[PDB]
């Protein structure tokens, strides 16, 4: 359950 | 989501808290060295790394964070490690050695002057990026998440420094620790043996602390003076004293030309074949 960075 | 952007292949590496996987992108096909770890110090230096660019350190691709990890997508290197690749060489000199060094010298210091300490620096972290004999030397697990287990509770609940008090004189990873580390190395790079190789353990620890250095012969003696004392600058007992990366990089040895070109593979590649556990 990610959130991807930039 | 980790899942389904990722194909996990295999295992490269677990410690106590982080774990690095072979991974291939689903979209792309593309391999990545994927290094999960399990969740402000750590952020920052996260921050540190999104910013930083050297050719002898693996880069960071992306990142995705969850409640519990963060996942660094890493460059995959995949021209193995720097012993076997000096046993596959067939010819091999002070030079040779000297240029590694030069790489891993500038990758450390660059890390020390944006505030990241290596630890923990060992043979099997120096990875060459590809197969080519002229490739670049590639440092990969590094920093505060690198994989050790320290102290009683590393593997139990992923919490280092479970060590007695009486134990450590200092907190156990520092610049000059680093710098140390890069001097056995570099022995080791010169003869196929560690420093003291055949002393007790217990002995070896009195032979640290003493810090009066051997380069016993045979082994040692078609090797430079130059060698030697650049070696023992970063060997140095005293921290305060001792060689940092870019002292040790402004040395003849690295930086000027007393670095032979000699060929000591045949004693180097018998000593790395006796003495190397994996041999
Ligand atoms: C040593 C255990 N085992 C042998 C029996 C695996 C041998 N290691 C590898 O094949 C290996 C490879 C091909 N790549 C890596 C490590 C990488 C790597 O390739 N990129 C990278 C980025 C960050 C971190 Cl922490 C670690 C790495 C490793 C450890
Ligand atoms: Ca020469």
Known sequence: ?6 | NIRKTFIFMEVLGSGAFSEVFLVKQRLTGKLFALKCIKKSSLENEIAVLKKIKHENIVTLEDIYESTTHYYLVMQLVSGGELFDRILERGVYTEKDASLVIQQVLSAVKYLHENGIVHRDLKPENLLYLTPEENSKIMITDFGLSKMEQNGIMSTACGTPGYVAPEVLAQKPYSKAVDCWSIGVITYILLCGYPPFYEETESKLFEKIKEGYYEFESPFWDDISESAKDFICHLLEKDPNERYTCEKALSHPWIDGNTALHRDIYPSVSLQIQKNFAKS
């Open chain 1, 1 to 6: 359950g990610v959130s991807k960075f930039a």
